[PDB]
Paper text:
Multisubunit Photosystem I (PSI) encompasses half of this Fe in its three Fe4S4 centers and is a target for degradation in insufficient Fe conditions, which reduces the capacity for CO2 fixation. TIDI1 (thylakoid iron deficiency induced) is an iron starvation induced chlorophyll-binding protein found in multiple green algae including Dunaliella spp. isolated from coastal Arctic waters and hypersaline ponds. PSI and PSII are each associated with LHC proteins for increased absorption cross-section, LHCA for PSI and LHCB (or LHCBM) for PSII. In this work, we report high-resolution cryoelectron microscopy (cryo-EM) structures of PSI-LHCI supercomplexes from Fe-starved compared to Fe-replete cells of both D. salina and D. tertiolecta.
Numbering used by the authors:
A (entry chain H): 69 to 133
B (entry chain D): 60 to 202
C (entry chain E): 60 to 123
D (entry chain C): 2 to 81
E (entry chain B): 369 to 441
F (entry chain A): 12 to 751
G (entry chain L): 47 to 150, 152 to 203
H (entry chain B): 516 to 588
Write the structure that this text describes.
């Protein structure tokens, strides 16, 4: 009884073609979700921005930007 | 030699403990080498891949992974106890090949029964330049 | 008989030899008709460490 | 495997076959040297290219030459 | 300007090293001495020891005295 | 059974073999046809195994070699004593050790070297020394330069005696092989006699000489009016006032009343607050206990009178089931192979030198040594490097024994044969643990570097962020701090101030203060464990695979030191055990360099410094806790925050340290020519130079040849080690003298 | 003599040790799913993937970049563990395509003879089924490790 | 100082030229190995015989010359 549930779990993905397609689909779906919707909901510190930081540069004068 | 000898599986083996240096998976999927020698008494010899073992009084059998191990053992036996051994090659399918004494008199002798192979009658350095054999598939030394 | 005198200095013109354009002393010349019957001895060793080598009749000349 | 070639400069000192721990070289009768011997390499495919025969060669230049290339499971000295 | 100069100088050095390497490849692979006998190429190959020795002399002299004056100062 | 077997006059004393430089080897006895003959002459000079196959001649040769080395060491020690007697400010340093820098080398005013004679104080100019000889000459009671002169003359006399002893014991009366094979007599005489008698003699010298001089020295008494040690030795009245136990006069010793000697044979923990070193009474009782413990240990083995222990019986008696035969043939191995004994002795000597470095940075045994940061750092680093070199040499000579002196007939199922049998398992497990240690010791550093560079210090492996607290080391520190309370109730204080709670300070500078261990200390200690595990992996793989291997089964017939077996099997370069040791030198260099960098940074950031009324300020403001978690932090705050005095040493007394620094950079960089390159290119370049010298007939009779592949590797590793050692030496000494 | 090679032959490498000759170790290794020859590759793959995907969720939740964020550390750790499980499943499928494009010619030759004809694990479609079981076990174990942080009497 | 570092630059150029030129001219033949042209441009060595033939090919000459080029630039 226990083996049957997992046998039917595997039977749809038993072929290496099927499992390669499944892992490819899940990988591209998860990567596309990340950044587009994966970021800015976890408050990832790449999609937030500065407050008022680091406009000037050059400690030896000239004061670019 | 006079007649090519076939190895016997009934010959005993020298007394030896478990050594991590020895046969590997290559002995199964690919060929492996078997060395055979006849001893007059029980002596102590060093294995080319392990420690020290005591050979038996009479025929002996050693299985080694490479032909270099077999010839190192052969040279050690000939230098130490003038054993004059011989080694075979057993393939994965069971084919047994005779390697070391093809003429039975060792490569040091000639026996006047073997032909010349890969011999150039020209001098070394008289080979043509690679430009002369370019796009031909043959090296200057292969001519 | 067919080569240089034994003990006479000869010059080796073999290009691939270590002693090209060098002077060696003849120690023996074979009379059995072999490929390189002239045997010479050099005072300076090669990289292999030997001091004697064999050359043909056309590879040895009298040095000036 | 590798290519092992013996030239006519060999004089049959039969020590190149002793220095080779793979039984690649063999001594055949000849007539171009005083010793009436010549090195031959029937089991060339068993060679690894260790150049011990070239070390043992007394002729200048070397009578036996070993050329590397086209490595195999026996030319690479692999026990696995 | 510093990055541009450093980039193009390292590129030039690597390219000159490749030039000499491929010239060596020409000399070993597809050089036919009987095709051009006695020309500038065969004559340069004839006294190659002189060229190499003089390059070694000028390099050794430059390095000896440059390091000597640098260590002295 | 044990007797003195000596052969008289085996070798004539003449200069016949001095005329011909190549005489020990039959290969070098012909002549120098090639230029590699000279390198083979200077390389096979002391290799006595291939000179002759007789063990007796080898034993005599190494006996007189040890005699010559002893004479050389005595000459050097006498020279140091002479330098302290003549060109030194030792008399000035005795009256003011906390303000006058030690100096024992005086340079000549010939060319610009007058700037090297720095103002070390006391009206004296010279090189500020770093060997700590002034501290040693203050520990042993030495007041005037006359006593140093006498010590130098006695050392020269003993050096001449040792050289004459070597000449006699080789050329005149050479011992036989059975004389050297008396292992039990050698062990008894070097346990009870050498070590025990020296410990007793030094204990007596400390009790009768060093204790009163040091008791008067730290009491403010000037050394001019301090009585000479012979007055203490002869007169019991003068020694009685300083130590009242001397009034009894050896009565408590024979009556077992040793508790009466608790004034000059004390058991005290910590350091003397006046000087900063260990108490001399503690050292006296220490060396007395060591003398007793070695005198009882030197009567263990059986030599001639029935009683005692047989080493062969002891070895053959210890046999446990998972080891087959246990220690069955080791007695025959160590009584017939000089190289196995050399390996064991070199390994233990190197390890004990490491112990010496650790236990004298921890507990300074000399007065005014802890405050002298330069002497302590130099001693720690020097004995660090000597121990590492001795351990690498132990691996080398073990591999040499494995190649040459090993015989498989004597040992079949002993420990050594089973070690060769499962060598692949040992090497594989050592490789696994090496890679695991490398990852979880260096990837932590790289990760901390990244999160610092990613602006995320809260993700660090640091104390402020999530941490790896060394709980075991801190628990051992707490146990040793509380050890005098319960487990050693007769100790006055803790055995060292590494784990203590008090900050001793002499002259306003911290002698020794408690050391706090944090995440960075954990990281560096595990890096040390990784580096030592990799180095021992390399050395043990070289030792184990010296005889044979799955690649080259006939590696034993190729000798110990051979360059390669050719480009076969993909290329068997550096396959010999010698090249394994050649890589081991570099790996020990890396290990000990990181170790001494850790030592210098940890001392300068958490121990060494100047004490103030408001707290204690270190040399560097505690940067090890917050900067040793990253490689960039290590770089910027140790190799760049320091070394600013080496570059700015020009025009000052330490300019020679900057010169040594840049010359060491040169020698370290010059080594990589011999390391990356091969021999064929250099041989062809030499051929071109030979053509050039042939053109105008200046060809040398000896043919110029390139250095051998093993010779080239040896030159490369030697120049690399020399450059790195001198680089660290110059940087460390200039930093610790210009600041500390 | 406790130390000896297996089956009394010394020419082999691996030798019989009390680490391996202990009955507890032998029965633990024989009863592991990877060495259960009589079971289908997908079932042992399911068990192996369940165990490995359950253990892989731990370090990602505990030491993740958002470990200080309450309520989102477990989600991020579990989805990163599931992504790692998918990466290992891709590795398993690639290894099955690689190492089993040919056909084995010999059995395993177990102790005292009695060898099975062919291990179904060592085939191409057998290893594909093993990888399928591995990834099914991996996501199911990851999902179980997530909800074990959802109901909790202690810590997570 | 400009003139001294210019001489250092000339030293680097001269040494790189020396090694590259020597590798190019000895690519096909040498006194240590006359038959270098038969072994290809990029081969490891000829073995431990004849004293030792490590880095004997012109490829290794280029490989050692890249270090000198990097130092010069
Ligand atoms: C910074 C380190 C360094 C230094 C100083 C050198 C120096 C040298 N190499 Mg180079 N080399 C190096 C690194 C270095 N190499 C590295 C890393 C590689 C890559 C493997 C190479 C690869 C290489 C090749 C391939 C070649 C050189 C060559 C040379 C020479 C060039 C000639 C010259 O400039 O005049 C001499 C330069 C000097 C710096 C002189 C150094 C000697 C001084 C005067 C001290 C002499 C001893 C002194 C008096 C003290 C005596 C006691 C002491 C010996 C104990 C010179 C000896 C060429 C050569 O030798 O042919 C001519 C050559 O073909 N090298
Ligand atoms: C090896 C180390 C050493 C040495 C050399 C000494 C030496 C000395 N100690 Mg010390 N001592 C030591 C260790 C040592 N001690 C240790 C470890 C302790 C334990 C803490 C002590 C504790 C101690 C105390 C408490 C006292 C001494 C005292 C003495 C002196 C008296 C000698 C004595 O009692 O025996 C000498 C007795 C002998 C039988 C020795 C015989 C030796 C003679 C010289 C033989 C000569 C024979 C010769 C061949 C014939 C004549 C030759 C002629 C031609 C010139 C002496 C200078 C006492 C002192 O200071 O008095 C002034 C004293 O009170 N010692
Ligand atoms: C998110 C991925 C995913 C996808 C696309 C599918 C899709 C499918 N699985 Mg599946 N399954 C999943 C996750 C997934 N499942 C999980 C997480 C488990 C628990 C381990 C199972 C366990 C499982 C079993 C045991 C069986 C299926 C079956 C099925 C099919 C019918 C749907 C069903 O009964 O669901 C449930 C269908 C092809 C059945 C099937 O193929 O019938 C022929 C079947 O026997 N699956
Ligand atoms: C446009 C100029 C040019 C051209 C047409 C060629 C063409 C050729 N050269 Mg030449 N060469 C050049 C420039 C050029 N090279 C330069 C600039 C150098 C100096 C660096 C060399 C040095 C050189 C040597 C020494 C040899 C050749 C060889 C060859 C042949 C094959 C090389 C090849 O593709 O292997 C493909 C090689 C690779 C795919 C390996 C790429 C690895 C690169 C080189 C290392 C880069 C470092 C690092 C990994 C980069 C990434 C950094 C990371 C942080 C991302 C071919 C005839 C070989 C030949 O003729 O065979 C006998 C040969 O022996 N050349
Ligand atoms: C108690 C007696 C005794 C003592 C003190 C020593 C002491 C020593 N022996 Mg040993 N040895 C002894 C008995 C003794 N031996 C016996 C009985 C044998 C034969 C079984 C040996 C066989 C032996 C060998 C084979 C070797 C030594 C060596 C050494 C030296 C080791 C180097 C060292 O640790 O630096 C300590 C250094 C010093 C303390 C410097 C001072 C050295 C003085 C001058 C030596 C005085 C001790 C001597 C025994 C006095 C009597 C000699 C007399 C004829 C004049 C050391 C001096 C090594 C060596 O050659 O060095 C000499 C060595 O290789 N020993
Ligand atoms: C207890 C000490 C000890 C003893 C008795 C021996 C004895 C021996 N060793 Mg061992 N060895 C030791 C320590 C020792 N070694 C240590 C510590 C190391 C690690 C570095 C080694 C590494 C080692 C190797 C790798 C080899 C030996 C070999 C040998 C043998 C001959 C050595 C020889 O002729 O050198 C000749 C002497 C020299 C070349 C002089 C040394 C000069 C060095 C290279 C440079 C020193 C520079 C100096 C530090 C600073 C000067 C700067 C400069 C500007 C002036 C002999 C059996 C060799 C052998 O064949 O064994 C049988 C061998 O291959 N040993
Ligand atoms: C600092 C320079 C350096 C470094 C880093 C290495 C690194 C290595 N050497 Mg080497 N070594 C060097 C110089 C160096 N070598 C030199 C100059 C010599 C000549 C004497 C040797 C001689 C030598 C010997 C003789 C031996 C080694 C061994 C090793 C290995 C040790 C494995 C380990 O524990 O470290 C852990 C691994 C590292 C430190 C590598 C960097 C890993 C960082 C932390 C990144 C982590 C992985 C990263 C996240 C993945 C990125 C993925 C990306 C591609 C997308 C490793 C491959 C030994 C070996 O084979 O293994 C024990 C060995 O036996 N080396
Ligand atoms: C980490 C390294 C682990 C090595 C494990 C094997 C040790 C080698 C081994 O098997 O030794 C076997 C040994 C027991 O054998 P015996 O008692 O018969 O051997 C004793 C004689 O050598 C004396 O047990 C140990 O050493 C236990 C401690 C291991 C630590
Ligand atoms: C107008 C003018 C002028 C002039 C100038 C001139 C005249 C210049 C020149 C320049 C030059 C004159 C340059 C040159 C350069 C060169 C080089 C850079 C080279 C290179 C080479 C190589 C790389 C090679 C290669 C090879 C080999 C190795 C072999 C064979 C092949 C080949 C050829 C490919 C003056 C100053 C008066 C003033 C101002 C203006
Ligand atoms: C540093 C030095 C020096 C100096 C000084 C000295 C070293 C001196 C001397 C010293 C000495 C001189 C020592 C020793 C002493 C003595 C002793 C150590 C003793 C002992 C004893 C014992 C052990 C025992 C005894 C006994 C008893 C108890 C009882 C009765 C019996 C008897 C007798 C047995 C010199 C210059 C030389 C050299 C260089 C270095
Ligand atoms: C440079 C180099 C050489 C060439 C080096 C040689 C031949 C040794 C040269 C030693 C010299 C001759 C010692 C003396 C140096 C000076 C002449 C001393 C000057 C002293 C002043 C007082 C004048 C090799 O032979 C070699 C071999 C294998 C691997 C790498 C290399 C390698 O890198
Ligand atoms: S390279 Fe080695 S294996 Fe090959 S023929 Fe020569 S000596 Fe024999
Ligand atoms: S490069 Fe040198 S060390 Fe390596 S196999 Fe060739 S000759 Fe030997």
């Amino acid at each position: 009884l226990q083996e049957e549930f997992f046998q039917r779990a595997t039977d749809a993905v038993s072929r290496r073609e099927a499992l390669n397609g499944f892992v490819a689909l899940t990988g591209v779906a998860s990567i596309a979700l990340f950044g587009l919707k994966g970021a800015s909901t976890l408050e990832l510190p790449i999609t937030k921005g500065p407050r008022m930081e680091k406009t000037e540069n050059g400690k030896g004068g000239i004061l670019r930007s | 030699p006079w007649k090519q000898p076939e190895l016997d599986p009934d010959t005993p083996s020298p007394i030896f403990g478990g050594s991590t240096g020895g046969l590997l998976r290559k002995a199964q999927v690919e060929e492996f080498y078997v060395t055979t020698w006849e001893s007059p008494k029980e002596q102590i010899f060093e294995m080319p891949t392990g420690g020290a073992a005591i050979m038996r009084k009479g025929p002996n059998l050693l299985k080694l992974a490479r032909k270099e191990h077999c010839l190192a053992l052969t040279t050690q036996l000939r230098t130490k106890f003038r054993m004059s051994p011989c080694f075979y090659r057993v393939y994965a399918d069971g084919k047994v090949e005779y390697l070391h004494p093809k003429d039975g008199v060792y490569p040091e002798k000639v026996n006047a029964g073997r032909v010349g192979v890969n011999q150039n009658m020209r001098s070394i350095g008289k080979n043509v330049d690679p430009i002369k054999v370019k796009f031909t598939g043959s090296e200057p030394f292969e001519i | 008989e067919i080569g240089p005198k034994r003990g006479s200095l000869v010059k080796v013109l073999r290009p691939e030899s270590y002693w090209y354009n060098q002077v060696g002393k003849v120690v023996s010349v074979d009379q059995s008709g072999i490929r390189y019957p002239v045997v010479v001895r050099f005072e300076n060793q090669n990289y292999a460490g030997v001091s004697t080598n064999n050359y043909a009749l056309d590879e040895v000349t009298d040095p000036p | 495997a590798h290519v092992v070639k013996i030239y006519d400069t060999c004089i049959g000192c039969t020590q190149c076959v002793r220095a080779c721990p793979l039984d690649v070289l063999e001594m055949v009768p000849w007539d171009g040297c005083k010793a009436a011997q010549m090195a031959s390499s029937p089991r060339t495919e068993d060679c690894v290219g260790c150049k011990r025969c070239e070390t043992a060669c007394p002729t200048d230049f070397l009578s036996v030459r070993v050329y590397l290339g086209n490595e195999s499971t026996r030319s690479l000295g692999l026990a696995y | 300007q510093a990055s541009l100069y450093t980039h193009h100088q390292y590129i030039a050095g690597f390219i000159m090293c490749g030039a000499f390497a491929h010239g060596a490849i020409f000399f070993i692979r597809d050089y036919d001495p009987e095709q051009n006998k006695g020309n500038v190429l065969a004559r340069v190959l004839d006294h190659k020891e002189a060229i190499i020795s003089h390059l070694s002399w000028v390099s050794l002299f430059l390095g000896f005295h440059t390091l000597g004056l640098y260590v002295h100062n | 059974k044990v007797k003195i077997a000596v052969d008289r006059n085996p070798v004539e004393t003449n200069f016949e073999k001095w005329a011909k430089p190549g005489h020990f080897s039959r290969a070098l006895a012909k002549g120098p046809n090639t230029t590699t003959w000279i390198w083979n002459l200077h390389a096979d000079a002391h290799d006595f195994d291939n000179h002759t196959s007789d063990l007796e001649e080898i034993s005599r040769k190494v006996f007189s070699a040890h005699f010559g080395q002893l004479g050389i060491i005595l000459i050097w020690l006498s020279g140091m004593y002479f330098h302290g007697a003549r060109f030194s400010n030792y008399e000035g340093w005795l009256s003011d050790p906390t303000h006058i820098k030690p100096s024992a080398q005086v340079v000549w005013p010939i060319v610009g070297q007058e700037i090297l004679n720095g103002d070390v104080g006391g009206g004296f100019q010279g090189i500020q020394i770093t060997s700590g000889f002034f501290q040693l000459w203050r520990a042993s009671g030495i007041t005037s330069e006359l006593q140093l002169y006498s010590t130098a003359i006695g050392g020269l006399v003993l050096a001449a005696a040792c050289f004459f002893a070597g000449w006699f014991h080789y050329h005149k009366a050479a011992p036989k092989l059975e004389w050297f094979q008396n292992v039990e007599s050698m062990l008894n005489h070097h346990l009870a006699g050498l070590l025990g008698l020296g410990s007793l003699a030094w204990a007596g010298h400390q009790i009768h000489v060093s204790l009163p001089v040091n008791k008067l020295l730290d009491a403010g008494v000037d050394p001019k009016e301090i009585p000479l040690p012979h007055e203490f030795l002869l007169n019991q009245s003068i020694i009685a006032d300083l130590y009242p136990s001397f009034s009894k006069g050896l009565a408590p010793f024979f009556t077992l009343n040793w508790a009466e000697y608790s004034d000059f044979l004390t058991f005290k923990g910590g350091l003397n607050p006046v000087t900063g070193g260990l108490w001399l009474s503690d050292t006296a009782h220490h060396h007395l206990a060591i003398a007793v413990l070695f005198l009882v240990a030197g009567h263990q083995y059986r030599t001639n009178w029935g009683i005692g222990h047989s080493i062969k019986d002891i070895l053959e008696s210890h046999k446990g089931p998972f080891t087959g035969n246990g220690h069955a043939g080791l007695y025959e191995i160590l009584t017939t192979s000089w190289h196995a004994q050399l390996a064991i002795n070199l390994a233990l000597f190197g390890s004990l030198s490491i112990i010496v470095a650790h236990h004298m940075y921890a507990m300074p045994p000399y007065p005014y040594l802890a405050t002298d940061y330069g002497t302590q750092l130099s001693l720690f680093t020097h004995h660090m490097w000597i121990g590492g070199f001795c351990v690498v040499g132990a691996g080398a000579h073990a591999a040499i024994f494995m190649v040459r002196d090993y015989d498989p007939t004597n040992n079949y199922n002993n420990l050594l044969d089973r070690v060769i049998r499962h060598r692949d398992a040992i090497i594989s497990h050592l490789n696994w643990v090496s890679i695991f240690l490398g990852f979880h010791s260096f990837g932590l550093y790289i990760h901390n570097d990244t999160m610092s560079a990613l602006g995320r210090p809260q993700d660090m492996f640091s104390d402020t962020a999530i941490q790896l607290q060394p709980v075991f080391a801190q628990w051992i520190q707490n146990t040793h701090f509380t050890a005098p309370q319960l487990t050693a109730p007769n100790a006055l204080a803790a055995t060292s101030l590494t784990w203590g709670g008090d900050v001793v300070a002499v002259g306003g500078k911290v002698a020794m203060m408690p050391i706090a261990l944090g995440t960075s200390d954990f990281l560096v200690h595990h890096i040390h464990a990784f580096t030592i595990h990799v180095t021992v992996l390399i050395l043990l793989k070289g030792v184990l695979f010296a005889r044979s291997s799955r690649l080259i089964p006939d590696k034993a017939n190729l000798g110990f030191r051979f360059p390669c077996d050719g480009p076969g099997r993909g290329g068997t370069c550096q396959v010999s055990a010698w090249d394994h040791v050649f890589l081991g030198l570099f790996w020990m260099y890396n290990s000990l360099s990181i170790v001494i960098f850790h030592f210098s940074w940890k001392m300068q950031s958490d121990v060494w410094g100047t004490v103030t009324d408001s707290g204690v300020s270190h040399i560097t403001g505690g940067n090890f806790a917050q900067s040793a978690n990253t490689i960039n932090g290590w770089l910027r705050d140790f190799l760049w925050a320091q070394s600013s005095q080496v570059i700015q040493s020009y025009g000052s007394a330490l300019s020679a340290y900057g010169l040594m620094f840049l010359g060491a950079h040169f020698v370290w960089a010059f080594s990589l020519m011999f390391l990356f390159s091969g021999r064929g290119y250099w041989q062809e370049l030499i051929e071109s130079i030979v053509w050039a010298h042939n053109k105008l007939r200046v060809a040398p009779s000896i043919q110029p040849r390139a250095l051998s592949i093993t010779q080239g590797r040896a030159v490369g590793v030697a120049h690399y080690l020399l450059g790195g050692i001198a680089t660290t030496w110059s940087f460390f000494l200039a930093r610790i003298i210009a600041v500390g | 003599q406790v130390i000896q090679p297996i089956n009394g032959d010394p020419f082999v490498g691996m030798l019989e040790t009390p680490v391996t000759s202990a009955p507890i170790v032998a029965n633990y290794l024989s009863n592991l799913p990877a060495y259960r020859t009589g079971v289908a590759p997908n079932l042992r793959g399911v068990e192996i993937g369940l165990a490995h995907g359950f253990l892989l969720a731990g370090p990602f939740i505990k030491l993740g970049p958002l470990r200080d964020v309450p309520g989102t550390a477990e989600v991020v750790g579990c989805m990163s563990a599931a992504g790692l499980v998918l990466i290992l499943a891709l590795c398993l499928s690639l290894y099955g395509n690689a190492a089993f494009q040919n056909q084995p010619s010999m059995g395993k030759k177990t102790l005292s003879g009695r060898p099975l004809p062919q291990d179904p694990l060592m085939s191409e479609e057998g290893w594909a089924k093993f990888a399928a079981g591995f990834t099914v076990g991996g996501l199911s174990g990851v999902a179980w490790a997530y909800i074990l942080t959802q109901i909790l009497p202690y810590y997570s | 100082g400009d003139f001294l570092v210019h001489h250092a630059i000339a030293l680097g150029l001269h040494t790189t030229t020396l090694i590259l030129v020597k590798g190019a001219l000895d690519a096909r033949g040498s006194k240590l190995m006359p038959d270098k042209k038969d072994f290809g441009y990029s081969f490891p060595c000829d073995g431990p015989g004849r004293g030792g033939t490590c880095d004997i090919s012109a490829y290794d000459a280029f490989y050692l010359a890249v270090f000198w080029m990097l130092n010069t630039i």
